[PDB]
């Protein structure tokens, strides 16, 4: 089975739990004192947002390769409400997930592409497929 | 007198 | 019909109001009766 035939929400939650269990993803110094997005009015509600977002990011990188900082910021954009003024669109943040892609580099699941960006390594693809099979097995039973 | 219904 | 429903009579009463009407010509127009006619129009009669 591939990652397509499993629930996307449960696959992300399972991968985030797996990263928490391993505990080897690189954690920046600014743990729970920064906002995930520019548009937000508050800090992230729940902890382990670093693991959950890294889980989703690895999934987006699986579907589409050769993605860099500019590609990621387009993806995770958020609905920026500016109160009295009409609301507009804001791209995702930059530095925090640079620690995520350095974390993935530390865990040896991303590799620099020939022209730019980061591409999935065999180690990362194998891990994503087995956890997908475990998710499917858990859903069935 | 606006043609609402259809002496 | 609203009066008929409350009416005691076995559908035997239908009063009619008949009133003679007289308008001079200055306000015949205002009433909208006797709207102005065409040049061949004038030579007409009752209307229908």
């Amino acid at each position: 089975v591939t990652v397509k035939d499993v629930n996307q929400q449960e696959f992300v939650r399972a991968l985030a739990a797996f990263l928490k269990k391993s505990g080897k993803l690189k954690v920046p110094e600014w743990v729970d004192t920064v906002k995930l997005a520019k548009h937000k009015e508050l800090a992230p509600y729940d902890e382990n947002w670093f693991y959950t977002r890294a889980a989703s990011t690895a999934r987006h990188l699986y579907l589409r390769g050769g993605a860099g900082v500019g590609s990621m910021t387009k993806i995770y954009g958020g609905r920026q409400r500016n109160g009295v003024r009409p609301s507009h669109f804001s791209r995702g943040s930059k530095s925090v997930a640079r620690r995520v892609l350095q974390a993935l580099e530390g865990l040896k699941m991303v590799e620099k592409d020939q022209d730019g960006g980061r591409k999935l390594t065999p180690q990362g693809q194998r891990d994503l497929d087995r956890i997908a099979g475990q998710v499917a097995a858990a859903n069935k039973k | 007198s606006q043609g609402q219904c259809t002496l | 019909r609203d009066i008929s429903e409350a009416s005691v009579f076995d559908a035997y009463v239908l009063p009619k109001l008949y009133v003679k009407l007289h308008y001079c010509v200055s306000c015949a127009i205002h009433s909208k009766v006797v709207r102005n006619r065409s040049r061949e129009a004038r030579k007409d009669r009752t209307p229908p």
């Binding site: 591939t2 397509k4 035939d5 499993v6 629930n7 996307q8 | - | -």
Partner: protein
Amino acid sequence: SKGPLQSVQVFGRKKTATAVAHCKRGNGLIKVNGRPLEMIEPRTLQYKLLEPVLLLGKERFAGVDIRVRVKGGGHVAQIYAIRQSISKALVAYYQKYVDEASKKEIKDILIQYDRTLLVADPRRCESKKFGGPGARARYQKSYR
């Protein structure tokens, strides 16, 4: 039996929602971008997506396979583009390779249920015209 190159490709549009179905003989897998037909993002409209499956025979969709690729559209538009894609992919395959008597009966059933499974809706976006925020509307104006 093992007949090569027995594949037919169909296309459907619903407000620039181009859905292409590559139908051939197979085990009966229906995938969209390699993602299962049931495992689609609009789970609320999943019943609409599976309507050809529930209407026509599951044996027919097990003998044949469909692959859907979408480049354009929206969310309701894309679901209907895919839904009409598999319906006319089955119709095209049932036209070319199997008895046409069954092709007439499945087409009659599809028309009886809903004609939109086969027809592309002509209605498109209507260009805005100056003087008002919408295409038909007018910018509210007062004399004084």
